[PDB]
Design a protein around this ligand. Structure first.
Ligand SMILES: [Mg+2]
Ligand SMILES: [Mg+2]
Ligand SMILES: [Mg+2]
Ligand SMILES: [Mg+2]
Ligand SMILES: [Mg+2]
Ligand SMILES: [Mg+2]
Ligand SMILES: [Mg+2]
Ligand SMILES: [Mg+2]
Ligand SMILES: [Mg+2]
Ligand SMILES: [Mg+2]
Ligand SMILES: [Mg+2]
Ligand SMILES: [Mg+2]
Ligand SMILES: [Mg+2]
Ligand SMILES: [Mg+2]
Ligand SMILES: [Mg+2]
Ligand SMILES: [Mg+2]
Ligand SMILES: [Mg+2]
Ligand SMILES: [Mg+2]
Ligand SMILES: [Mg+2]
Ligand SMILES: [Mg+2]
Ligand SMILES: [Mg+2]
Ligand SMILES: [Mg+2]
Ligand SMILES: [Mg+2]
Ligand SMILES: [Mg+2]
Ligand SMILES: [Mg+2]
Ligand SMILES: [Mg+2]
Ligand SMILES: [Mg+2]
Ligand SMILES: [Mg+2]
Ligand SMILES: [Mg+2]
Ligand SMILES: [Mg+2]
Ligand SMILES: [Mg+2]
Ligand SMILES: [Mg+2]
Ligand SMILES: [Mg+2]
Ligand SMILES: [Mg+2]
Ligand SMILES: [Mg+2]
Ligand SMILES: [Mg+2]
Ligand SMILES: [Mg+2]
Ligand SMILES: [Mg+2]
Ligand SMILES: [Mg+2]
Ligand SMILES: [Mg+2]
Ligand SMILES: [Mg+2]
Ligand SMILES: [Mg+2]
Ligand SMILES: [Mg+2]
Ligand SMILES: [Mg+2]
Ligand SMILES: [Mg+2]
Ligand SMILES: [Mg+2]
Ligand SMILES: [Mg+2]
Ligand SMILES: [Mg+2]
Ligand SMILES: [Mg+2]
Ligand SMILES: [Mg+2]
Ligand SMILES: [Mg+2]
Ligand SMILES: [Mg+2]
Ligand SMILES: [Mg+2]
Ligand SMILES: [Mg+2]
Ligand SMILES: [Mg+2]
Ligand SMILES: [Mg+2]
Ligand SMILES: [Mg+2]
Ligand SMILES: [Mg+2]
Ligand SMILES: [Mg+2]
Ligand SMILES: [Mg+2]
Ligand SMILES: [Mg+2]
Ligand SMILES: [Mg+2]
Ligand SMILES: [Mg+2]
Ligand SMILES: [Mg+2]
Ligand SMILES: [Mg+2]
Ligand SMILES: [Mg+2]
Ligand SMILES: [Mg+2]
Ligand SMILES: [Mg+2]
Ligand SMILES: [Mg+2]
Ligand SMILES: [Mg+2]
Ligand SMILES: [Mg+2]
Ligand SMILES: [Mg+2]
Ligand SMILES: [Mg+2]
Ligand SMILES: [Mg+2]
Ligand SMILES: [Mg+2]
Ligand SMILES: [Mg+2]
Ligand SMILES: [Mg+2]
Ligand SMILES: [Mg+2]
Ligand SMILES: [Mg+2]
Ligand SMILES: [Mg+2]
Ligand SMILES: [Mg+2]
Ligand SMILES: [Mg+2]
Ligand SMILES: [Mg+2]
Ligand SMILES: [Mg+2]
Ligand SMILES: [Mg+2]
Ligand SMILES: [Mg+2]
Ligand SMILES: [Mg+2]
Ligand SMILES: [Mg+2]
Ligand SMILES: [Mg+2]
Ligand SMILES: [Mg+2]
Ligand SMILES: [Mg+2]
Ligand SMILES: [Mg+2]
Ligand SMILES: [Mg+2]
Ligand SMILES: [Mg+2]
Ligand SMILES: [Mg+2]
Ligand SMILES: [Mg+2]
Ligand SMILES: [Mg+2]
Ligand SMILES: [Mg+2]
Ligand SMILES: [Mg+2]
Ligand SMILES: [Mg+2]
Ligand SMILES: [Mg+2]
Ligand SMILES: [Mg+2]
Ligand SMILES: [Mg+2]
Ligand SMILES: [Mg+2]
Ligand SMILES: [Mg+2]
Ligand SMILES: [Mg+2]
Ligand SMILES: [Mg+2]
Ligand SMILES: [Mg+2]
Ligand SMILES: [Mg+2]
Ligand SMILES: [Mg+2]
Ligand SMILES: [Mg+2]
Ligand SMILES: [Mg+2]
Ligand SMILES: [Mg+2]
Ligand SMILES: [Mg+2]
Ligand SMILES: [Mg+2]
Ligand SMILES: [Mg+2]
Ligand SMILES: [Mg+2]
Ligand SMILES: [Mg+2]
Ligand SMILES: [Mg+2]
Ligand SMILES: [Mg+2]
Ligand SMILES: [Mg+2]
Ligand SMILES: [Mg+2]
Ligand SMILES: [Mg+2]
Ligand SMILES: [Mg+2]
Ligand SMILES: [Mg+2]
Ligand SMILES: [Mg+2]
Ligand SMILES: [Mg+2]
Ligand SMILES: [Mg+2]
Ligand SMILES: [Mg+2]
Ligand SMILES: [Mg+2]
Ligand SMILES: [Mg+2]
Ligand SMILES: [Mg+2]
Ligand SMILES: [Mg+2]
Ligand SMILES: [Mg+2]
Ligand SMILES: [Mg+2]
Ligand SMILES: [Mg+2]
Ligand SMILES: [Mg+2]
Ligand SMILES: [Mg+2]
Ligand SMILES: [Mg+2]
Ligand SMILES: [Mg+2]
Ligand SMILES: [Mg+2]
Ligand SMILES: [Mg+2]
Ligand SMILES: [Mg+2]
Ligand SMILES: [Mg+2]
Ligand SMILES: [Mg+2]
Ligand SMILES: [Mg+2]
Ligand SMILES: [Mg+2]
Ligand SMILES: [Mg+2]
Ligand SMILES: [Mg+2]
Ligand SMILES: [Mg+2]
Ligand SMILES: [Mg+2]
Ligand SMILES: [Mg+2]
Ligand SMILES: [Mg+2]
Ligand SMILES: [Mg+2]
Ligand SMILES: [Mg+2]
Ligand SMILES: [Mg+2]
Ligand SMILES: [Mg+2]
Ligand SMILES: [Mg+2]
Ligand SMILES: [Mg+2]
Ligand SMILES: [Mg+2]
Ligand SMILES: [Mg+2]
Ligand SMILES: [Mg+2]
Ligand SMILES: [Mg+2]
Ligand SMILES: [Mg+2]
Ligand SMILES: [Mg+2]
Ligand SMILES: [Mg+2]
Ligand SMILES: [Mg+2]
Ligand SMILES: [Mg+2]
Ligand SMILES: [Mg+2]
Ligand SMILES: [Mg+2]
Ligand SMILES: [Mg+2]
Ligand SMILES: [Mg+2]
Ligand SMILES: [Mg+2]
Ligand SMILES: [Mg+2]
Ligand SMILES: [Mg+2]
Ligand SMILES: [Mg+2]
Ligand SMILES: [Mg+2]
Ligand SMILES: [Mg+2]
Ligand SMILES: [Mg+2]
Ligand SMILES: [Mg+2]
Ligand SMILES: [Mg+2]
Ligand SMILES: [Mg+2]
Ligand SMILES: [Mg+2]
Ligand SMILES: [Mg+2]
Ligand SMILES: [Mg+2]
Ligand SMILES: [Mg+2]
Ligand SMILES: [Mg+2]
Ligand SMILES: [Mg+2]
Ligand SMILES: [Mg+2]
Ligand SMILES: [Mg+2]
Ligand SMILES: [Mg+2]
Ligand SMILES: [Mg+2]
Ligand SMILES: [Mg+2]
Ligand SMILES: [Mg+2]
Ligand SMILES: [Mg+2]
Ligand SMILES: [Mg+2]
Ligand SMILES: [Mg+2]
Ligand SMILES: [Mg+2]
Ligand SMILES: [Mg+2]
Ligand SMILES: [Mg+2]
Ligand SMILES: [Mg+2]
Ligand SMILES: [Mg+2]
Ligand SMILES: [Mg+2]
Ligand SMILES: [Mg+2]
Ligand SMILES: [Mg+2]
Ligand SMILES: [Mg+2]
Ligand SMILES: [Mg+2]
Ligand SMILES: [Mg+2]
Ligand SMILES: [Mg+2]
Ligand SMILES: [Mg+2]
Ligand SMILES: [Mg+2]
Ligand SMILES: [Mg+2]
Ligand SMILES: [Mg+2]
Ligand SMILES: [Mg+2]
Ligand SMILES: [Mg+2]
Ligand SMILES: [Mg+2]
Ligand SMILES: [Mg+2]
Ligand SMILES: [Mg+2]
Ligand SMILES: [Mg+2]
Ligand SMILES: [Mg+2]
Ligand SMILES: [Mg+2]
Ligand SMILES: [Mg+2]
Ligand SMILES: [Mg+2]
Ligand SMILES: [Mg+2]
Ligand SMILES: [Mg+2]
Ligand SMILES: [Mg+2]
Ligand SMILES: [Mg+2]
Ligand SMILES: [Mg+2]
Ligand SMILES: [Mg+2]
Ligand SMILES: [Mg+2]
Ligand SMILES: [Mg+2]
Ligand SMILES: [Mg+2]
Ligand SMILES: [Mg+2]
Ligand SMILES: [Mg+2]
Ligand SMILES: [Mg+2]
Ligand SMILES: [Mg+2]
Ligand SMILES: [Mg+2]
Ligand SMILES: [Mg+2]
Ligand SMILES: [Mg+2]
Ligand SMILES: [Mg+2]
Ligand SMILES: [Mg+2]
Ligand SMILES: [Mg+2]
Ligand SMILES: [Mg+2]
Ligand SMILES: [Mg+2]
Ligand SMILES: [Mg+2]
Ligand SMILES: [Mg+2]
Ligand SMILES: [Mg+2]
Ligand SMILES: [Mg+2]
Ligand SMILES: [Mg+2]
Ligand SMILES: [Mg+2]
Ligand SMILES: [Mg+2]
Ligand SMILES: [Mg+2]
Ligand SMILES: [Mg+2]
Ligand SMILES: [Mg+2]
Ligand SMILES: [Mg+2]
Ligand SMILES: [Mg+2]
Ligand SMILES: [Mg+2]
Ligand SMILES: [Mg+2]
Ligand SMILES: [Mg+2]
Ligand SMILES: [Mg+2]
Ligand SMILES: [Mg+2]
Ligand SMILES: [Mg+2]
Ligand SMILES: [Mg+2]
Ligand SMILES: [Mg+2]
Ligand SMILES: [Mg+2]
Lengths: 275, 48
RNA sequence: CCGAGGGUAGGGCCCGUGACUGGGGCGAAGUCGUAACAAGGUAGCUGUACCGGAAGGUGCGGCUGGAU
RNA sequence: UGGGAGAGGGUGGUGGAAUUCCCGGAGUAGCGGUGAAAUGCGCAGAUACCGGGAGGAACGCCGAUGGCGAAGGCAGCCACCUGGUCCACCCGUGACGCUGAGGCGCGAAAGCGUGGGGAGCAAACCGGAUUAGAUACCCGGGUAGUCCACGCCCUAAACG
RNA sequence: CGAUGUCGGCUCGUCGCAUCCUGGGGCUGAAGAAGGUCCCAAGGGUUGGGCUGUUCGCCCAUUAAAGCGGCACGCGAGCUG
RNA sequence: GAAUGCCGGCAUGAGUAACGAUAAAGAGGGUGAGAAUCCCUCUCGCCGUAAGCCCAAGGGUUCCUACGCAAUGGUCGUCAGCGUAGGGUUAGGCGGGACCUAAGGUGAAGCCGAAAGGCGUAGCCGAAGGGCAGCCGGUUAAUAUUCCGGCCCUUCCCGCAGGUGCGAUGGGGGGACGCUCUAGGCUAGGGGGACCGGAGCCAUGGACGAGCCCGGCCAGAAGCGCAGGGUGGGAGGUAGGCAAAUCCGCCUCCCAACAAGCUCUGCGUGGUGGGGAAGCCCGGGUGACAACCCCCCGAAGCCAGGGAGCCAAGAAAAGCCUCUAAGCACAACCUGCGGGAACCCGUACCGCAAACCGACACAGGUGGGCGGGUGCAAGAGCACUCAGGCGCGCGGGAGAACCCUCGCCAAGGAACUCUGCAAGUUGGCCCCGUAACUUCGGGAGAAGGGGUGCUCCCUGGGGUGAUGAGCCCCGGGGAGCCGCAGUGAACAGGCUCUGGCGACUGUUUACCAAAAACACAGCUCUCUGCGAACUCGUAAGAGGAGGUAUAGGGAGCGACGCUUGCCCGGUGCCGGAAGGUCAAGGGGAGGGGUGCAAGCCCCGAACCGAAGCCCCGGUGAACGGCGGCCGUAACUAUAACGGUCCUAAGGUAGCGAAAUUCCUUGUCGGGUAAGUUCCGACCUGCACGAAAAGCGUAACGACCGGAGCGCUGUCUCGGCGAGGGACCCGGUGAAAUUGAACUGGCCGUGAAGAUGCGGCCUACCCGUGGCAGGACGAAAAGACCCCGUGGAGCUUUACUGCAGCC
RNA sequence: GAGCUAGCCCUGGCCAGGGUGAAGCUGGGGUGAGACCCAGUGGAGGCCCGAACCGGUGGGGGAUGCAAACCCCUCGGAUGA
């Protein structure tokens, strides 16, 4: 449930914040954090390659277990649910009866004190991870691997999920968060349930400063520039686009499809996203 | 007002120094030319 | 000291009036179509919504105060 | 105290028919639609037929002139939570009652806000007809909306 | 064109006269008073505001009158801008 | 002899401007060849959140002393940051290194690239971050946490004693973290004392006093006290912490728990060692056997790794502790003690500036710490002032114009002007009071007004004590006194009504534009299924992202409210397995060259053969577009209505003479005595119009309009006054410019605006202060204009390529 | 050549004083329970006033300057993009 402010400044009128209600621990596990090296959007040449990035709040990286098939059969207690600055989901601290501690991304409805486990024998319950071929059709899952043992790639952002739609040979068919239908190998692991913090999408930043805290520097329109800078640059006074709307680099940006045509994964994609 | 020269001994040695020049092809050509011209100083003098 | 009142400043209510504008009533000797009363020629009415020169139309739901 | 009937309400599940779309097959010269047509769709393989899949909405028969609710209104089936009401016994309390300006709550549809969902239908809109004309009635399309959650709106031929 | 700064204003004037006023006249369809028209005359004088960058013009209140032109559309090594 | 030629020299301007903050000077004494300028004394002024003191950069002997004055110093110079010479910088504990890691750099392995080279996990380097042992005082002309004195401490080596399964680059713990607010107790620093010490003072009318003036501390092991930080203990199980582990993690049981205990730091005390004023005598002696106490205020610093709240969720590694492995267990490690050992570099001086960056001893720029007192509500603001430091390296006169900065002004009060530009007004605190509108926050300090000093009396509460006095803080009531005036000086909003644009706080053309422009939350379109799309790179490799569609890229629009119509024929994008066209290649009918010949060689039709284009659909918050004529209603006028041409389709809602309206100062209304502006309307909109968004919108604005009140030297219309210059005298002494000059007016003439030609007029020679009409005055080979088959930036359905993609 | 300037990365530092008084919390009221109302507490914010600090709005001066961007008065931000 997103929280509002009274309008005691012009920016508080619309600013909203997450309630942070599921959070039960305000400090991360010291052995599972490491420094997140800030880039400012610059690559190893020192060149900006993603514009308008930098200046955000300092963050530490929490190490997330995106495998879980690491520890088949070994159950674990949900010790805590915590804030993670590096992702939209919340994260859940797991205490394995092994004694090993690990973070997973927190599913919707996960409960502190419940147990979870991974493996082909795991109950079909929120927080458990199983190979796709052992999760029943109709189940909604998250943290899905795309290829066996390569780590969870799909449905990791707050509120997202994928749904198992059918089985075909070694592969299962999923409806991805985007609405795409895709074959994914049956030996790929997934976690049952949707990702939590589903109210993430309803947050209103409220003021320019809040984007800056997140490391988003101001984005300047091509139409605000000069012809040296951008296809939309120049013109006396305001100008319409005067040509097909284009990126800074000249390629068209309303409709032009950009997925590579002869890509091998096309044999595994059944229906392109619809919305 | 604030002018262009803001001396800094570490900056000077690290940017124009003998070891910086010897690192790159361009820098070694600088030393070669300065030795060929007969310059009394091949690299800027900075205290340290 | 209080004090008629006068002065300064800011509020509240009422009345008259105003370029222009909105619809209303009446007039009747005009122009347009004919929406309602018959199954009124698409049964009617209705709250709401969107639309149309106009009466009005259509959607959604409701009523019979609807002919056969 | 002991029984009863019921689409009364709320929540979570869940079944089959049918429409549409997608896939595989088989097949060919039309299909659709109307008062009659045309637009539309179809040899770039439609309609009709079989198999598979996806998804939303509404629940045929039972069904009635029936039942329930204060009204609005409520209809596949299962479970949980919950309201009203009737009967029999004539056991308890001993007028504790009736109404009810204000207040408070509920309140069809359409509409609104945020976010979902979207098969069918369908305001606006586009086109075909009809016609003297036809911003309509009929036909082919079609977006809101219709559906879900939460919050508003508070109207009605909200009628017996 | 190896530069002659360009509208308007302010300041400071000076000149022409085809004279706005004041002085002198003739004609009048000049009774008087007030006008009209032309002639002589440049000595002096020729207001303050509203609008607009304005020059101009319109308007307000006056005035004997509220003249028109030239001086690099006078005057930025004088100011403004 | 000329090239705005080149180099050098030397003129002119000219004894002219200027001599660098308007903080300010005067006199006496000394020195010396020479003194406004050096030294000394007295008086005066200026700074004092500095214009004082400490540190880091940077500078590099500028430091100290002697001798000196040619040049440097804007004058002078005996002086000096200048010349010559001699001297001066002392560390186990301060800073850096023999420690750690950050970005980043480098780089075994490895990857890539014509060469040069580019990457790259580990490792290494890399600091103003982590870590680590010294405080006070004395001494020199010049260094001092460095020398000395006192009292403390660290590491390494060796040895002795006691103790223990010792042992690591390996495991674990810890180091280890934000922002805002903040408790308790302290310290730094400060105020007061009728108390303690002190040389002296009684003046000029009074005072021998609870008089005046001065000072009343600093460092300190162990121990102790106070205040805080850190940490639970025992056993059992164990499959995790890439070996092992008794450690850590996990599970279970017992006990302990907001306690204590153990531990650590701060503060106080503490053997001991120091310091020690005014005044007076010549930095030093004395004061002095100095005293060294009480009360109050009190940090932003300390205890600290404290506490709370919040979202944007806040380094690493070593030191340290613990675990064990090889090994080794006569070793080794731990603890105590003792002796020995302890290297390299920096250290002067300037450091908001005359020593650093600005060519200068330049009104500019330069990071950190301390920065006293009183009063003003507070404060680092303001006035004055302490310590301390200065009077700004030309002066002396005069008392014009004019300029600058400043003060005042009768009557009027915006009449000034493009504009109230500028300058007035207002001005702090307390109390009263406060409108439309509003998104309910605000608008608001709205507006407007009352109070404000001092004296006496009475009284309320808090802090520190002790519960009281004292001190300190916050009040209340009554009665009085003085002046023109009580935030009595300094610092400190003028206000209101109403439009345009932009929602808002922010950002910008360094150095002519701060805005209505950019950004901005927010809205929509679109791409992207992850080895993502996209970006940079030849590549490897990177960013994206250790992210995963509630995510990331691109584009437009720009809070919010109410909305966002019609046109898909052209362009773009998306979809379309048909058809047309389509290159290499395949195919090889048929033909050719040559050879006696097998053969060699060449051309070449049908047919097959991708993307692309054509073709068929879709698509507007994709590029974009959104008509004309004729007729018609009881008078006129107009035209709901009909007709017709054209088109892909003919502009909807809303708005409109507008940041858009040409005609235009449209017309009408308002305001004014008067209104080309402004506001409100009308609509024949030259040429608004719906995300290059349309129409509104509270709040906000150094944005641009219009109006009123207040108040004014803006003005009528100017006057006076002050200081810094201008002016005169002594000192020093530029500049652009300059064909040469013995350089007047008029009317003419002249390449068409003449000091220089003609005629006439006027005119003795030479300066000084002033004014700017001319010398087509100076400056810059015209910021316009054209020309050159001159150049460059930008665009595209110009041409031709290339990357890239298919 | 990034010792100026622009962006980013790592690691440190700075922001006197005063004002307004959000959420929350506690108590009271209210109700079937609530919502909600009032008071106290609290201390939020690209909040307000204003130094340091960062700026550069209007005017005046300067214009062979003190200065190849300075000076005076005034003015913007000053817990934050
Ligand atoms: Mg709220
Ligand atoms: Mg809010
Ligand atoms: Mg709030
Ligand atoms: Mg707001
Ligand atoms: Mg919250
Ligand atoms: Mg949460
Ligand atoms: Mg939640
Ligand atoms: Mg934290
Ligand atoms: Mg770690
Ligand atoms: Mg990382
Ligand atoms: Mg990174
Ligand atoms: Mg790198
Ligand atoms: Mg590099
Ligand atoms: Mg980019
Ligand atoms: Mg960037
Ligand atoms: Mg960030
Ligand atoms: Mg999170
Ligand atoms: Mg397979
Ligand atoms: Mg969230
Ligand atoms: Mg968002
Ligand atoms: Mg964005
Ligand atoms: Mg932008
Ligand atoms: Mg531009
Ligand atoms: Mg460029
Ligand atoms: Mg280009
Ligand atoms: Mg371009
Ligand atoms: Mg353009
Ligand atoms: Mg243009
Ligand atoms: Mg433009
Ligand atoms: Mg334009
Ligand atoms: Mg532009
Ligand atoms: Mg533009
Ligand atoms: Mg623009
Ligand atoms: Mg525009
Ligand atoms: Mg456009
Ligand atoms: Mg254009
Ligand atoms: Mg165009
Ligand atoms: Mg591309
Ligand atoms: Mg794949
Ligand atoms: Mg610097
Ligand atoms: Mg250095
Ligand atoms: Mg350095
Ligand atoms: Mg450096
Ligand atoms: Mg070097
Ligand atoms: Mg040299
Ligand atoms: Mg030599
Ligand atoms: Mg060199
Ligand atoms: Mg009265
Ligand atoms: Mg009277
Ligand atoms: Mg009808
Ligand atoms: Mg009819
Ligand atoms: Mg009918
Ligand atoms: Mg209409
Ligand atoms: Mg019509
Ligand atoms: Mg219709
Ligand atoms: Mg009904
Ligand atoms: Mg009837
Ligand atoms: Mg039935
Ligand atoms: Mg009974
Ligand atoms: Mg309702
Ligand atoms: Mg409804
Ligand atoms: Mg609705
Ligand atoms: Mg018609
Ligand atoms: Mg639809
Ligand atoms: Mg709609
Ligand atoms: Mg809608
Ligand atoms: Mg009925
Ligand atoms: Mg010229
Ligand atoms: Mg010249
Ligand atoms: Mg010239
Ligand atoms: Mg006359
Ligand atoms: Mg007469
Ligand atoms: Mg005559
Ligand atoms: Mg005259
Ligand atoms: Mg004359
Ligand atoms: Mg005029
Ligand atoms: Mg005119
Ligand atoms: Mg006129
Ligand atoms: Mg008169
Ligand atoms: Mg007269
Ligand atoms: Mg003239
Ligand atoms: Mg002319
Ligand atoms: Mg002219
Ligand atoms: Mg002129
Ligand atoms: Mg002139
Ligand atoms: Mg000028
Ligand atoms: Mg002029
Ligand atoms: Mg001139
Ligand atoms: Mg002149
Ligand atoms: Mg010659
Ligand atoms: Mg010359
Ligand atoms: Mg010359
Ligand atoms: Mg020359
Ligand atoms: Mg020369
Ligand atoms: Mg000379
Ligand atoms: Mg002289
Ligand atoms: Mg001269
Ligand atoms: Mg000078
Ligand atoms: Mg000077
Ligand atoms: Mg002297
Ligand atoms: Mg002398
Ligand atoms: Mg002296
Ligand atoms: Mg130097
Ligand atoms: Mg020294
Ligand atoms: Mg020396
Ligand atoms: Mg000398
Ligand atoms: Mg001399
Ligand atoms: Mg001399
Ligand atoms: Mg000299
Ligand atoms: Mg000299
Ligand atoms: Mg000098
Ligand atoms: Mg001498
Ligand atoms: Mg000197
Ligand atoms: Mg000596
Ligand atoms: Mg020592
Ligand atoms: Mg060593
Ligand atoms: Mg290292
Ligand atoms: Mg190092
Ligand atoms: Mg260090
Ligand atoms: Mg040290
Ligand atoms: Mg010590
Ligand atoms: Mg010394
Ligand atoms: Mg950490
Ligand atoms: Mg730190
Ligand atoms: Mg902060
Ligand atoms: Mg102390
Ligand atoms: Mg004090
Ligand atoms: Mg006496
Ligand atoms: Mg006393
Ligand atoms: Mg204590
Ligand atoms: Mg174990
Ligand atoms: Mg101590
Ligand atoms: Mg002493
Ligand atoms: Mg503070
Ligand atoms: Mg957050
Ligand atoms: Mg590291
Ligand atoms: Mg062994
Ligand atoms: Mg031990
Ligand atoms: Mg050594
Ligand atoms: Mg030293
Ligand atoms: Mg300064
Ligand atoms: Mg300083
Ligand atoms: Mg100094
Ligand atoms: Mg110097
Ligand atoms: Mg000087
Ligand atoms: Mg200076
Ligand atoms: Mg002090
Ligand atoms: Mg004050
Ligand atoms: Mg004050
Ligand atoms: Mg101040
Ligand atoms: Mg003092
Ligand atoms: Mg002076
Ligand atoms: Mg001086
Ligand atoms: Mg004089
Ligand atoms: Mg001055
Ligand atoms: Mg006056
Ligand atoms: Mg007035
Ligand atoms: Mg007045
Ligand atoms: Mg004005
Ligand atoms: Mg004041
Ligand atoms: Mg009002
Ligand atoms: Mg209000
Ligand atoms: Mg507000
Ligand atoms: Mg007031
Ligand atoms: Mg106001
Ligand atoms: Mg007094
Ligand atoms: Mg002052
Ligand atoms: Mg103020
Ligand atoms: Mg107003
Ligand atoms: Mg606007
Ligand atoms: Mg703005
Ligand atoms: Mg703007
Ligand atoms: Mg806006
Ligand atoms: Mg905005
Ligand atoms: Mg803004
Ligand atoms: Mg701000
Ligand atoms: Mg510029
Ligand atoms: Mg500029
Ligand atoms: Mg510059
Ligand atoms: Mg510039
Ligand atoms: Mg420039
Ligand atoms: Mg300027
Ligand atoms: Mg600017
Ligand atoms: Mg801009
Ligand atoms: Mg903008
Ligand atoms: Mg919007
Ligand atoms: Mg590239
Ligand atoms: Mg890579
Ligand atoms: Mg990455
Ligand atoms: Mg990456
Ligand atoms: Mg991502
Ligand atoms: Mg509103
Ligand atoms: Mg339309
Ligand atoms: Mg089109
Ligand atoms: Mg098209
Ligand atoms: Mg069409
Ligand atoms: Mg085109
Ligand atoms: Mg296509
Ligand atoms: Mg076919
Ligand atoms: Mg053949
Ligand atoms: Mg032959
Ligand atoms: Mg093809
Ligand atoms: Mg749309
Ligand atoms: Mg077009
Ligand atoms: Mg467009
Ligand atoms: Mg007619
Ligand atoms: Mg108009
Ligand atoms: Mg007008
Ligand atoms: Mg307009
Ligand atoms: Mg226009
Ligand atoms: Mg025109
Ligand atoms: Mg006009
Ligand atoms: Mg005009
Ligand atoms: Mg007019
Ligand atoms: Mg105007
Ligand atoms: Mg008109
Ligand atoms: Mg645009
Ligand atoms: Mg508007
Ligand atoms: Mg603004
Ligand atoms: Mg502004
Ligand atoms: Mg004056
Ligand atoms: Mg005076
Ligand atoms: Mg004077
Ligand atoms: Mg004077
Ligand atoms: Mg001569
Ligand atoms: Mg002439
Ligand atoms: Mg001439
Ligand atoms: Mg002449
Ligand atoms: Mg002559
Ligand atoms: Mg001659
Ligand atoms: Mg001659
Ligand atoms: Mg002559
Ligand atoms: Mg003459
Ligand atoms: Mg002249
Ligand atoms: Mg002059
Ligand atoms: Mg001449
Ligand atoms: Mg001239
Ligand atoms: Mg030129
Ligand atoms: Mg030239
Ligand atoms: Mg030229
Ligand atoms: Mg030229
Ligand atoms: Mg230019
Ligand atoms: Mg020309
Ligand atoms: Mg040519
Ligand atoms: Mg070119
Ligand atoms: Mg840091
Ligand atoms: Mg601050
Ligand atoms: Mg309060
Ligand atoms: Mg709380
Ligand atoms: Mg603020
Ligand atoms: Mg603020
Ligand atoms: Mg300025
Ligand atoms: Mg001013
Ligand atoms: Mg002035
Ligand atoms: Mg000036
Ligand atoms: Mg100049
Ligand atoms: Mg200049
Ligand atoms: Mg200044
Ligand atoms: Mg100033
Ligand atoms: Mg100010
Ligand atoms: Mg402020
Ligand atoms: Mg502040
Ligand atoms: Mg604040
Ligand atoms: Mg701010
Ligand atoms: Mg910040």
């Amino acid at each position: 449930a997103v929280k509002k402010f009274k309008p005691y400044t012009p920016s508080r009128r619309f600013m909203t914040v997450a309630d942070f209600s599921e959070i039960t621990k305000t400090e991360p596990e010291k052995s599972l954090v490491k420094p997140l090296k800030k880039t400012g959007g610059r690559n190893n040449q020192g060149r900006i390659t993603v514009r308008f990035r930098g200046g955000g709040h300092k963050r530490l990286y929490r190490i997330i277990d995106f495998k879980r098939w690491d520890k088949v059969g070994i159950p674990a207690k949900v010790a805590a649910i915590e804030y993670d600055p590096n992702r939209s989901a919340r994260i859940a601290l797991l205490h394995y009866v092994d004694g090993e501690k690990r973070y997973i991304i927190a599913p919707d409805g996960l409960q502190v004190g419940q147990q979870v486990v991974a493996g082909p024998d795991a109950p079909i319950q929120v927080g458990n991870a199983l190979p796709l071929r052992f999760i029943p059709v109709g189940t909604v899952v998250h943290a899905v691997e795309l290829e066996p043992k390569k780590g969870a790639k799909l449905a990791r952002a707050a509120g997202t999920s994928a749904q198992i739609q059918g089985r075909e040979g070694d592969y299962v068919i999923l409806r991805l968060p985007s609405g795409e239908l895709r074959k994914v190998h049956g030996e790929c692991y997934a976690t049952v349930g949707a990702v939590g913090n589903a109210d993430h999408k309803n947050i209103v930043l409220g003021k320019a400063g809040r984007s800056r805290w997140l490391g988003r520097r101001p984005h300047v329109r091509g139409a605000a520039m000069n012809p040296v800078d951008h296809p939309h640059g120049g013109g006396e006074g305001r100008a319409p686009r005067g040509r097909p709307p284009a990126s800074p680099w000249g390629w068209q940006t309303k409709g032009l499809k950009t997925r590579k045509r002869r890509k091998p994964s096309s044999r595994f994609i059944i229906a392109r996203r619809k919305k | 007002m604030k002018r262009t020269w803001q001396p800094n001994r570490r900056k000077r040695a690290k940017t124009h120094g003998f070891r910086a020049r010897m690192r790159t092809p361009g820098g070694r050509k600088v030393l070669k030319r300065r030795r060929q011209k007969g310059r009394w100083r091949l690299t800027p003098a900075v205290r340290k």
